[model samples]
Target: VQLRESGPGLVKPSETLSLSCTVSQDSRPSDHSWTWVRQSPGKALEWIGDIHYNGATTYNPSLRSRVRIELDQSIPRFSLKMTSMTAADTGMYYCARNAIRIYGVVALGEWFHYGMDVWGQGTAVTVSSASTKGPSVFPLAPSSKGTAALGCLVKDYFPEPVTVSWNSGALTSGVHTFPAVLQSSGLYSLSSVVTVPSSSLGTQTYICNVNHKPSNTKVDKRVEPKS
Candidate 1:
């Protein structure tokens, strides 16, 4: 049971977020291994992953590719981290206490439902951040059912800046190209967008990923890349 992960920004609809949580307090794993779990705005807790003192661990497997857990009890604080994040990772993340194994011969009598037994008051990292752009995507027709093509604009914060993409979960292998409008701000005001079918809009997880250095960063307006 510990507090881990910090920073700013949203996980979008299907982006993979890389996180890390270090452990302190107990130098051994007997007090139960560290686990990674999250809860949505109004949903029950979900298991992400876990690791033990001797380094034995287990994940839901279903989320194995999307989840990762790292431990270091010797430091007094256990740690957890994950990648390929999305809106699903927008909730408060915390470490949890673990009892014995389900069928471990040592604790054959008692039972336990795994969850965060101890925690630090959680904080909300909202998907909402104040953004600045020159132009706006006005509404469509009088009764059109689709949304306007809201292009992305931003104040980049890096050198040799990069562009991001948006897509549905159907694309098997491909990359969305960005406009070649060279301008000032080097890599700051760069952005990209693609009007996907409404069916591909909110149904699957989306990721606003950067095609630049530090592949794990979440740039402004990098909405969601479903696939």
Candidate 2:
């Protein structure tokens, strides 16, 4: 089985963080449970909740009121919805498969477990200022040396220090990154440029990945756009 996560990279404070994990359970779909766990900065991992294949759910009381965990039989996927977010709720959220052991009869019991046995790629959701916005991706353009140049602009987001990087099929020989610029409001606005050999420009996909660590949000943009 395989799993993946998809959701917003940034969320404003007091808002909700909605996430889902797609599980490809070919034949044993009814033999397992799914879960959502998170790793907060400088903090230990957390067991958010889990939904058994039979529709039963268990959650951490610490977040029971603000959390919702359910399985969508139609989609054959599991979802987690958390309301009233804050800076403290920022982290790398993951969708995972939980191990379950069911015992039979009148006093039957079911044991649901956790860990890294099955995990999604994880979506980093950051809780930033209501005014914070997404990065503006400039069109990929040609460089002076017949190479490819791409950049992104992330502005006015809080929790200090930030980062910018590249993820693509292109080589990193000419990668050039800039320092994060701290604004007067104590947030950041920064940019970065990566040079790809001209020959591979239109033939490859490039990602401008940026993030605000303290707020736990990351922005990843692919060079290719829809027609």
Candidate 3:
């Protein structure tokens, strides 16, 4: 089975790290468990956790309170979200295949691991203030209905996630799909969109703003749509 890892390449101290592994659906069985594992700059491989497509999960106690594993049955992907990061958390992260175990009757708690046999290319995340970056704004071609489609790509800003919003004379409204996906480089990428009526094109200025929470920093990009 092939898997691809995606997330931010950098994470600021005290920020959260979000990542996902998209595995080839053709290779996954409904009963298989997916997992996340990592190694420090050069430390031992550590098990972060595992989650079955059905949603059962097991995590390392050291990070139990901060780590969460999610399974997206629709895409059949595995995702990880870890909070309150520190430099000590910096590492080369990986998504691995975790073998599922079945227990029939009550037995003394003992476990054995296949230990991350199948793997994805590693992504190294650095935890430091310099890791935060900003967002870039772009416009998508008008839809068949002629509404201008605007998009914002926010990359590697952390300590937590940022919020993206649009304004064109007035605040534009739409659902924002914000995924702080960890990338191959160990940082992250989040994207958003806003739709504006062509009637407002050139009539008003559009603004896309990203606010990084931990640093209370705000960065925005604005554009005027062509007629």
Candidate 4:
């Protein structure tokens, strides 16, 4: 009756992307077929493959070499694995139940029509590319009279892992970082905020350092508030 899609949100270029579709127990796997589909940004939906209850499978000819669809009867779930990923592979992946309708029998031989009836909440997957740009650091208007807040916006980075820190010496408190978010361009962006005493805002200079591993690059931006 229901389907859910689970998978990694980010995948490195030239790596493998794996996903799973879990079916509700009320639905009998032996009586239905399942399939995987994807839609690229601003593009039409494309069918990737399908698997019948009896274990027979079919795939899109264009992706046959890099894609695999399998069913696990014990768990009543199906999985999708695609290898050698690239920026072109970034998209929203969905899994749906294919309702099979028998058209005829006997002398004419049985023919069937497969129509998707239920679908999973699609999972967004980003196949990352190298970082060609660095982050932009800016000062946020002081929220309170005595404190100053600075924000670092790291955009267009790859591999979903980036390190950001402030040069104002290590202070465990008043720092917050958010998880990286995938963008429509198949890149990622992250944000971090640091708070310092307002008195030091004009007298001191703060530097935001960003380290992106996939590109093996480090970028630093300095912010100096005007008195």
Best by lDDT: 4
Q: What is the clash tally of candidate 1?
A: 30
Clashes of each: 30, 0, 16, 0
Candidate 1 wrongly placed segments (more than 4 Å): 1-16, 22-24, 27-31, 99-116, 123-227
- Arrange candidates, best TM-score first: 2, 4, 3, 1
lDDT per residue (tens digit) for residues 62-82 in model 4: 999999999888777899999
lDDT, candidate 1, 1-227, per-residue tens: 34544433344344445445544454444546567677776888777777766677788777887666666555645555456555555676656666444434444645354545655444333332223223211111111245323334433433223444443334323334454444563333444444545554455443443443322344433344323
Candidate 2's TM-score: 0.62
lDDT value, residue 139 of candidate 4: 48
* Model 4 alpha-carbon drift over 4 Å, by segment: 103-111, 129-227
Better of 3 and 4 by TM-score: 4
Error of 4 at 151 (Å): 18
Whichever of 1 and 4 has more lDDT, that candidate is 4
Candidate 1 positional error at 204, Å: 54
TM-score of 4: 0.57
The global C-alpha lDDT for each of the candidates, from Candidate 1 onward, is 0.48, 0.71, 0.70, 0.77
lDDT of 3: 0.70
Pairwise TM-score winner, candidates 1 and 4 = 4
